[PDB]
Amino acid sequence: SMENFQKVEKIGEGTYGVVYKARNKLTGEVVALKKIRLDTETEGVPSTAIREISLLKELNHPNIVKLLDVIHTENKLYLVFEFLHQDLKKFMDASALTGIPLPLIKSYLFQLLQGLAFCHSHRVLHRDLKPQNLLINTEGAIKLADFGLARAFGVPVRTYTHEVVTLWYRAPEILLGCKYYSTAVDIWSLGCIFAEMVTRRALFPGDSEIDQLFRIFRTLGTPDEVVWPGVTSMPDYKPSFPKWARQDFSKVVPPLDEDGRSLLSQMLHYDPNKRISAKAALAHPFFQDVTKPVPHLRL
Amino acid sequence: NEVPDYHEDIHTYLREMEVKCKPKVGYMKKQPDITNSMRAILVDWLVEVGEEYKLQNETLHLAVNYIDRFLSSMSVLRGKLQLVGTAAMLLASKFEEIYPPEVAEFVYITDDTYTKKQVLRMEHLVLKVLTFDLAAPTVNQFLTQYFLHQQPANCKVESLAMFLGELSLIDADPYLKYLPSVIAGAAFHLALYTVTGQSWPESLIRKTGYTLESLKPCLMDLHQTYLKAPQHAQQSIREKYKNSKYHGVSLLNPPETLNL
Numbered sequence: 001s002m003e004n005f006q007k008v009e010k011i012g013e014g015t016y017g018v019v020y021k022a023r024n025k026l027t028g029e030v031v032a033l034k035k036i037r038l039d040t041e042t043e044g045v046p047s048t049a050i051r052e053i054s055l056l057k058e059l060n061h062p063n064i065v066k067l068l069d070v071i072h073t074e075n076k077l078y079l080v081f082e083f084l085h086q087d088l089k090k091f092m093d094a095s096a097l098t099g100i101p102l103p104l105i106k107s108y109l110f111q112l113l114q115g116l117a118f119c120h121s122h123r124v125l126h127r128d129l130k131p132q133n134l135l136i137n138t139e140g141a142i143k144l145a146d147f148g149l150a151r152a153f154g155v156p157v158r159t160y161t162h163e164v165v166t167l168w169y170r171a172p173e174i175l176l177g178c179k180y181y182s183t184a185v186d187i188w189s190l191g192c193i194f195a196e197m198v199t200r201r202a203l204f205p206g207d208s209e210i211d212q213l214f215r216i217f218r219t220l221g222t223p224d225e226v227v228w229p230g231v232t233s234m235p236d237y238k239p240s241f242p243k244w245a246r247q248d249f250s251k252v253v254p255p256l257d258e259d260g261r262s263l264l265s266q267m268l269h270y271d272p273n274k275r276i277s278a279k280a281a282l283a284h285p286f287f288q289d290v291t292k293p294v295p296h297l298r299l
Numbered sequence: 300n301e302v303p304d305y306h307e308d309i310h311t312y313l314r315e316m317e318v319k320c321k322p323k324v325g326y327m328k329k330q331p332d333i334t335n336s337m338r339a340i341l342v343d344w345l346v347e348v349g350e351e352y353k354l355q356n357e358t359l360h361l362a363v364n365y366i367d368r369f370l371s372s373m374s375v376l377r378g379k380l381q382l383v384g385t386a387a388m389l390l391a392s393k394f395e396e397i398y399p400p401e402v403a404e405f406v407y408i409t410d411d412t413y414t415k416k417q418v419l420r421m422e423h424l425v426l427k428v429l430t431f432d433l434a435a436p437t438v439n440q441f442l443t444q445y446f447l448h449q450q451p452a453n454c455k456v457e458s459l460a461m462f463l464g465e466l467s468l469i470d471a472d473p474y475l476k477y478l479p480s481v482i483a484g485a486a487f488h489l490a491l492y493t494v495t496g497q498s499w500p501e502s503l504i505r506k507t508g509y510t511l512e513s514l515k516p517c518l519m520d521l522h523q524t525y526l527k528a529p530q531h532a533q534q535s536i537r538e539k540y541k542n543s544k545y546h547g548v549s550l551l552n553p554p555e556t557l558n559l
């Protein structure tokens with residue numbers, strides 16, 4: 001079954017399966033394999049595989065990683081994806097000294113938002129946007145990856161799984177333990193990633209639930225029923241929260257002009273209904289000049 | 300409540316998809332050992348199973364779809380019908396539920412007719428047959444979307460529309476003939492007019508493109524089913540909708556009339 005593929009090296013994990021770098025011996029195609037075991041605890045085919053596979057078939061788009069094949073072995077299950085140069089994390093890490101060229105950010109964000117609006121229009125929530133799950137090629141494009149946490153939603157949304165996202169990119173409503181979350185959550189994440197590409201450091205490096213929330217409040221101000229109608233009668237909301245005042249954005253995102261910080265602001269509204277959509281964001285004046293730069297490596 | 304940006308695209312997409320994940324209509328006729336009757340039995344049993352574990356209706360709506368699809372391309376003996384049933388449901392639960400019941404649980408609820416390995420292997424076979432195409436539209440997805448056009452959203456109608464759709468799932472013929480959006484179309488209006496007398500909204504005609512004329516063949520089939528509810532050999536679905544959770548909706552009298 002795999003007699004066609006030559007493993008070159010392991011590339012990483014995410015702890016769900018392992019990820020190898022393979023080459024097809026016949027075509028010479030280079031692929032990313034994701035190996036998955038099923039004889040784990042006689043618990044059948046894992047949920048995190050079933051959903052990923054079935055939704056990634058539904059999703060075909062230039063900014064969403066290509067799933068090429070799925071190979072059925074009795075004890076293993078290999079997913080074959082297209083292979084890319086690196087993830088945004090290790091590229092930011094590399095580009096850490098110079099910092100990311102100004103319009104290359106604009107490009108990446110634009111593409112990323114194209115991808116997310118595709119997901120949302122096919123009733124899919126990603127739920128684990130973070131630089132580790134976003135892959136770049138050499139051609140200057142960027143794709144969403146690792147739909148291990150994704151799920152198909154209903155309209156209107158029902159109560160879905162609480163323990164989601166990654167903490168640094170987790171949205172308020174979930175930290176605060178809300179009964180219903182929506183498309184809004186992915187946007188929040190993409191928001192924090194935008195800020196991180198710009199400032200060179202994560203936006204909310206929180207260490208726990210409470211620490212993450214306060215890090216948010218200390219930047220954006222603690223919210224009230226004006227800023228967020230519903231906040232005060234939410235499940236884990238506590239009237240004894242400290243009262244932090246909101247701060248200046250050119251202070252937060254110094255390199256951004258008026259437009260970028262306008263945009264960013266809307267991607268981070270406490271209120272989900274108020275929080276800008278992926279769709280609506282695509283039409284934002286900040287994208288006026290959007291062009292497609294190519295990054296330097298020397299890998 | 301929500302930012303409703305994509306309602307249009309999403310509704311569009313499910314309409315496009317519901318065509319593709321649609322089971323074959325006269326499939327039972329091809330099947331050497333199973334009957335529409337057997338299938339009703341199966342669906343009814345699936346329904347108690349859903350209650351016992353407090354499972355979403357969505358979960359069983361998918362489950363049913365998975366079966367019709369599987370049995371559309373795979374000849375199966377009555378002896379093994381229940382097992383296709385259980386795996387289908389386990390997959391559904393896996394896909395939809397926050398806390399799906401353990402594999403163990405599923406084997407339990409089968410009279411201990413089948414082993415665990417049997418169930419787990421079946422799980423795998425079903426995925427192979429459906430080629431992992433599990434993200435399917437159902438009647439529930441349409442209803443829940445449709446329900447948004449209701450002011451003020453009225454509990455009883457909602458619980459009755461949900462009830463009706465479910466009834467359709469017990470009956471292969473005539474309901475395999477209709478797309479979920481139409482089953483939903485029918486049930487919603489039929490509920491609306493049993494409870495408030497009011498009409499399939501102009502709003503939904505604009506979204507769906509369906510007129511009452513265009514829904515009529517379905518509705519005729521659906522009315523008689525509601526009518527003869529207490530004579531059908533499948534009862535669990537009725538009993539389910541007697542509770543304080545669903546406002547005892549099965550106990551209402553179906554309307555005399557539709558103006559034919």
Ligand SMILES: Nc1nc(OCC2CCCCC2)c2[nH]c(-c3cccc(S(N)(=O)=O)c3)nc2n1
Pocket residue numbers: 011012013014019032065081082083084085086087090132133135145146
């Ligand atoms: N298709 C695909 N997926 C990937 O990530 C899958 C994992 C994403 C993170 C969560 C687990 C699944 C890839 N990673 C790299 C890749 C290529 C070159 C270098 C690197 S890295 N991380 O800089 O060593 C990654 N190419 C990749 N190609």
